[PDB]
Each structure stands twice: as C-alpha cells, then as structure tokens.
Amino acid sequence: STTTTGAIAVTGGTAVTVAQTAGNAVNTTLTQADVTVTGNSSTTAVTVTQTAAATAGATVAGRVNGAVTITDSAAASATTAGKIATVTLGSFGAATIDSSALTTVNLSGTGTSLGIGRGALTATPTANTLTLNVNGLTTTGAITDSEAAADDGFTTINIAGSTASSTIASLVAADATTLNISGDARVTITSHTAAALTGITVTNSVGATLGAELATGLVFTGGAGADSILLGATTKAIVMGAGDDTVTVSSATLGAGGSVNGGDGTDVLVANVNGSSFSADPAFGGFETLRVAGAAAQGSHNANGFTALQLGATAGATTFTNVAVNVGLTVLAAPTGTTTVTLANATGTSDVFNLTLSSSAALAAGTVALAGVETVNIAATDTNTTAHVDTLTLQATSAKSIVVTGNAGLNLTNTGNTAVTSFDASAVTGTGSAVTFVSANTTVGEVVTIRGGAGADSLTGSATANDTIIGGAGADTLVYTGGTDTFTGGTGADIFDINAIGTSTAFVTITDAAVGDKLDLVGISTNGAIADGAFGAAVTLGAAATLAQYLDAAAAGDGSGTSVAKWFQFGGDTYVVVDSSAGATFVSGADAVIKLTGLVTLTTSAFATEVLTLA
Amino acid sequence: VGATLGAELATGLVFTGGAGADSILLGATTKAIVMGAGDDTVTVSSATLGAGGSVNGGDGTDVLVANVNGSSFSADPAFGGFETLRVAGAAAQGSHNANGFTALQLGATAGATTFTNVAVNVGLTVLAAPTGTTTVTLANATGTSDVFNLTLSSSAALAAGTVALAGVETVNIAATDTNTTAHVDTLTLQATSAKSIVVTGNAGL
Numbered sequence A: 001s002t003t004t005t006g007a008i009a010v011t012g013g014t015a016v017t018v019a020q021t022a023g024n025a026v027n028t029t030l031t032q033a034d035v036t037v038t039g040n041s042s043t044t045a046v047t048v049t050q051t052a053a054a055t056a057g058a059t060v061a062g063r064v065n066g067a068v069t070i071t072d073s074a075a076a077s078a079t080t081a082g083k084i085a086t087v088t089l090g091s092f093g094a095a096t097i098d099s100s101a102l103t104t105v106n107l108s109g110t111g112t113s114l115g116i117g118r119g120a121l122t123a124t125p126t127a128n129t130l131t132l133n134v135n136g137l138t139t140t141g142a143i144t145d146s147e148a149a150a151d152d153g154f155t156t157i158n159i160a161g162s163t164a165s166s167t168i169a170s171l172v173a174a175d176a177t178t179l180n181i182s183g184d185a186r187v188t189i190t191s192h193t194a195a196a197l198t199g200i201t202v203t204n205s206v207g208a209t210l211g212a213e214l215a216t217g218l219v220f221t222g223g224a225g226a227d228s229i230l231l232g233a234t235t236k237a238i239v240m241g242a243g244d245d246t247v248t249v250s251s252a253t254l255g256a257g258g259s260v261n262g263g264d265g266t267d268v269l270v271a272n273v274n275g276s277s278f279s280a281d282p283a284f285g286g287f288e289t290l291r292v293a294g295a296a297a298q299g300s301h302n303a304n305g306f307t308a309l310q311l312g313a314t315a316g317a318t319t320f321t322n323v324a325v326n327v328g329l330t331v332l333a334a335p336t337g338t339t340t341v342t343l344a345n346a347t348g349t350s351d352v353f354n355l356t357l358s359s360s361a362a363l364a365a366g367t368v369a370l371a372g373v374e375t376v377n378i379a380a381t382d383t384n385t386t387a388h389v390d391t392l393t394l395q396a397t398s399a400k401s402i403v404v405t406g407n408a409g410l411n412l413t414n415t416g417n418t419a420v421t422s423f424d425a426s427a428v429t430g431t432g433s434a435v436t437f438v439s440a441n442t443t444v445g446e447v448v449t450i451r452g453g454a455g456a457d458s459l460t461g462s463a464t465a466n467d468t469i470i471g472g473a474g475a476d477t478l479v480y481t482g483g484t485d486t487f488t489g490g491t492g493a494d495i496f497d498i499n500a501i502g503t504s505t506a507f508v509t510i511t512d513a514a515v516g517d518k519l520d521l522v523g524i525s526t527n528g529a530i531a532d533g534a535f536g537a538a539v540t541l542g543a544a545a546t547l548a549q550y551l552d553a554a555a556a557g558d559g560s561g562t563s564v565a566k567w568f569q570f571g572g573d574t575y576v577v578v579d580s581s582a583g584a585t586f587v588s589g590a591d592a593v594i595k596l597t598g599l600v601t602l603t604t605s606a607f608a609t610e611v612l613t614l615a
Numbered sequence B: 001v002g003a004t005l006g007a008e009l010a011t012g013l014v015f016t017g018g019a020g021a022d023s024i025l026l027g028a029t030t031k032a033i034v035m036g037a038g039d040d041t042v043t044v045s046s047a048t049l050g051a052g053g054s055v056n057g058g059d060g061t062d063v064l065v066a067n068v069n070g071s072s073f074s075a076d077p078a079f080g081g082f083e084t085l086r087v088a089g090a091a092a093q094g095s096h097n098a099n100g101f102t103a104l105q106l107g108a109t110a111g112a113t114t115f116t117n118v119a120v121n122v123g124l125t126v127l128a129a130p131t132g133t134t135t136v137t138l139a140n141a142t143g144t145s146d147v148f149n150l151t152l153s154s155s156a157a158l159a160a161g162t163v164a165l166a167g168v169e170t171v172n173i174a175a176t177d178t179n180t181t182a183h184v185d186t187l188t189l190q191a192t193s194a195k196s197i198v199v200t201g202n203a204g205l
Ligand SMILES: [Ca+2]
Pocket: A117, A118, A119, A120, A121, A147, A151
C-alpha cells in the first residue's frame, strides 16, 4: 500500500525481532510502521529491520522509515539490573534505546537519529564501553549518548565498520574519552561532538574519515588504509600510519609541539591556508602530495620536496613555487583566480609539465600559467561513465607541444601561446569528448600540426601557417584561415569550414572528402551568397589542359554581383572554385580554389545554405 | 691556495677551479661552471642562470653569495655543492630561501633582507654593515627551547644593524675581532621571546 503500516508493539520474550518490508509501486511513497519493543526481564536482544528509505522517483519506490522505541524493564529503576545487551537496527526513523545493560548496537541501512539512554540506575557504572558495529549505514542526523549529558555515559566508543561504507552525519558523546574505529570497510563521521576526547584510534583496513576538525589537544592515530582528518594548531603528535592518508590543515604552523607524520604510502597534505612551506618545518613529515583546497586556501605555496601537486576550490589566486622536475599538477575542482606554476628550473629547452584535470562532472579549471615549459601534457579525466567537457585557459608562452590525453573533452583557451607548433589531442576517447583548439601562432610560413580525438572536435589553424589539421572519429569542424593547409577529417560527418580565400599556391587541400562530409563556403560568398541548387556538372576540358587553364575556365563567368561555384578534375585530384570576379581570369586575390585529393564526383551533391553536402 | 677574480665573468665564459679557495662573480651564465675541491666562493648577480647554465661548488665547504632581490638556490638543480648562503652586494636584498644550507652569512646590502625556512642549528654570521632590518624566521619556531647562534665577525668596529629573531628562547652572540687591535660592535636585537642572551667573543658589544 501507500497508506502507512500501522503500529507494531512487542512486550517480553528471550529475544525479539521485528522485520518490516515495503513493496509499494515505483512512483509512490509508503511510510513504514512505528515500532515499540518493551523487554521483560528475559530480553537479552532486540532487532528491528525495515526497507531502506528512498525518494519517490520515476522508477524509484519511495519509503520513509518508522520511529523505533526500545525499552528494557529496569529502565526507570534506581537499582534493578536491566537485561537488554544487544540491539540490531536495519534502517530507522527517529530511534531510541533505553537500557542500563546495553553494550552493543548493530547498525545497517538508512537512519534518521539514534538516541541511546542507559537505565536511571543511581549507582556509578563501571563497564562503559559502547560497541557500535556499522555496515552500510547512512544517517540523516545524530547518534547521541543521551545518558552522558546529565548522567554517566560511555567513556569509550568503538565503531566497527563492516563489508560496506558507512556515514554517520553526527556523533554526539559528551562523556567519551577514547574512540576506536576498527574493522573492514570505511567509517565516515561527518561531525563529532565529543569535547572530553583524549584520543582517537583507527585500526580499520579501508580507513576512517572525520569531517570535523579535531581539538588542538586531541591525539589521533591512523592504521593501514586511507584515514582522513582536519587539524588546526595541534599540540599533539599526530600519526597517520600506512596507506594513502589525507590531512587538511587550517593553520600553516602547528603549536606547542605539535607535529603530523603521514607515515608510509602516498599521503596528501591539504593546505587550507594563505601560504605554506611544509618541507622546511620538521613538524610535518611523510607527505608526498601537496593539495591547495579549502575556503581559506590561497597565495604562495612551497612545492619543494613534494612528488605531486593537487588543486581544489580556493579562496583566491594560488601559486606553486620551487616545483621540481617531473612533478605534475592535478586539478580536482574549480579554483578561484589564476593558478601559477613556477618551476625549480625553467631555463632548459626540453621542459615537460604534466597537467591533469580529474572530475566526475564538467570542470572549469580556470587559468593555469606555465612560463618556460616547452611540452605541456594535459590529461582530461572523467571519473564516471557519463561524458563531459572540461575548460582551461592555458598560459604557456614557450610551449612548442601540447599533447592532450584522457576520456573527457577539453575546450582549451590558447590565446597568446604563440610558440605552439604541435597540438596533439589524438589519444582522447568518448562518443563526445569534444576538443576545441585555435592556434595562436603568428610565425610566417610555419608548419603547425593540429590533431583531434574521438570527439566532435573544433580545430582552427592560423592564417600565418601551413596547418596540417586532422580530426579523429566524430563530427569534426576544421577551419581554414590562410596559407598552405592540409585537412583530414577522419571518420564521421566532418565539416570543412572555409573562412579564407587563399591564393593559387597557398590553398587548402582536403585529403579524404567522402560521402557525408560538408564544405562550408559561407566565408567566401564575397559578393552575395552561393548557388543554393544541386549545381553539379563538372567542368570538362581537353586531355592535356593545365591547372591554370581549368581555373580560368571555371572562373569564366561573372561573379561581380553574385558569387558562383564550379568544380573540375585535374591530374587525379578534384578542385572546387568560387568565382567572385568579372573577367575569365581566375584572379588569385578574390577568386578561390579548394583541392580535394582523389577523384570525388560532386555531380549529385547539393548546396544547403552555402554548404555543400557530399552525396 | 686558489685564485680569486673580482670581475664578473662573461656569460659565455667557462671557469674551472682546482683544490683551494677559488673565488669568482657570475651573471646569467650559459656554461657549466665547476669549482673543484677546497672552500670556494661564487657571487651571482642574477638569481636564475640561462641557456644551461649551471654552477657546482664541488667538494668542501663552499659559499654562495646572492647579489640579488631574492633567492631559492636549493630548489634549482643548476646550483649544487654549496653549504653556506651569504647575502652581500650592491643589489642584495629581500626574501632568501635558507633551506638546505648549513650556515648563513651577511655583508653590505641594498636593502632589508629576510632568511626564510632556516633549519635548526643553523647560525648567521654578519661580516659587514647591512641595510635595513635583517629578519631570520626559522623552519620551526614553535618549541620552547629554541637556540640561535648569531656571530659578528670583522677586523674593525661593526654596526650589525637590526636582526629580528621571533620565537627564539636562547640567543647566543659571538662578537669576533679578526685582528689584534680592540673594537666595539653594535647590534639592535629584536627577540621578543628570548629568556637568555649569552655573549661570547673578544670584541665589545
Ligand atoms: Ca537515564
């Protein structure tokens, strides 16, 4: 049903299990049953399972969870023992337990809040260890020790994560002293409120992450596996253990003394600060990667002695100084202001930098400046299965090569990068990992090579240059600007967008024009706008007519008021002409020729607007 | 014993030292400068070299002199084999990365000069009157037993000027006279958490 599951109450028994399910339809919401268990003095264990909560979607069955209330016999007594030792939950709304004999809680699925009270026993309790086994648990809100506030709570909390990731939105334990996170799968505590904590100790294989910034007085010890914390001006010796760990610091220098060692493995140090020099400070050790990310992250950062660099969202413009050779930057989120990299030594002529862009969604990497680097390698990386296009302004005024790899698109702003003679995005991979590039090269008579990838790419050369442009798979747009250009749109419906007139010597050759490819002549319509028909009888001349003769023949008509297209086949190759002139001379200046390698018959092929589609 | 050349070498010009204290001035050098054994001394007029464009101090304790607006020589693999960083010259000034040096020196300067990322047990020797406040900031000042060794070393009376040592608890000053005829050095110390000042030496302060 969509109408909600009515109460469930149990009283008494050696052990109790109430197992709800919800089987409602795919666009409805059923809210589940309120459960109450009240033990008699035989009740050692209680279990209350439900179906996991979800939001009513197009194909998602909606479920809200029922409150659960568990109460032991001796819950209100000042003296009587109490019998409920273990409680197991499998999803829940606003849950309560109240038992002075409680040691273990097993959590699972989707929760709202758990409030743990112990019996109102007046005697001061001696055993005060909450074992809290988690497995696939996610919480809207707080696990609280209700007893700790005004009475005698648990002094030591143990959390054993198991077979699946768990996330506790908030853990509130005001009498807690030790906190040990153990087991088998990640435990994440988004926010703890445990002022009296003297230590935290991860022993867990996958690791533990704590989203709340630790107390400056609070010791933390990691184990194997990716543990992950936030520190301020710490007073204590923080150890991170083995595996790939992550500490975020809110202040650049520590305090008292006041240290943090990353331990074995590749560990990230995150600088949420106005500048850093972590290599210098012996207080920090065992770190390999420096990441600049956070709401206070900004300014000048000493890269020295790190083997890798990362960047996330930032407060303002951030600069990496003293960057050693073979050290690459990975950008993980949109930063604020220009990101400058300045290397240890830029002076050589074979300088290589590895920039990486790595995100699940479209990433606006912003401006990164790489003065004195000759080869710039860009990886554009998508972390999920669904395709996107990243954006970057590169300022690399002495780069000769740009190579793009990866599996996401890159629209690259290239303004002012005038040394670039080789753009190679050929290795790029998705349906639409679309690469956009425009050469900023102005060296007269240069050889420039532009390579597209699997995406629907948009590659523009330079009027200055003899551009070789090659799209990969997909709907590529190759732009002609001037000079002796060689175009190859690979597989797919490519568009050869002709925006310049050229000469009789400096013109575009299109190597592989085939059925489906287009020839956009909008930009050479000097006088008016082209044919518009299916204009398709080849100009024919004699067995030994010259290219010069065929050109003159093709331009014989009057193009003064209205430009006209014609075409011919000379010496084994196919040519297209735009006549924009009076006399029967093809005039180099305003009349235009386009070469197409091979015999391609344009008989049946038709002019769209000023756009010729090969038939 | 060595050779010393007071003129700045041509940027095109190769130099090779032997054993013994050789000593030159370099600009934006284009060539691979070697200094050999013994306690050598190169003064650079520009912070980064050129073309390529390197200078190796070789064996022994060698001084690198920064006649520049800031330095970070540890980072640049173009410079290697140096042990002491001195800030001295008519263009010498600003922020200087002490990292990876085992000693520090100071001479006459263009303006206020700052030593950053200074490792523990690294001392400064002042050799001539500088211009503007000389700030030392250590790698880690946070402890409560921080010791710094300042030395003043001259033949004549030396006006060391202001040196700032934020976060140092014990400041040791040596006042050293290099000749037989007595003098008195002068210093403004700014050491707002120093509990001890110990003065040794054979000249006045
Ligand atoms: Ca109570």
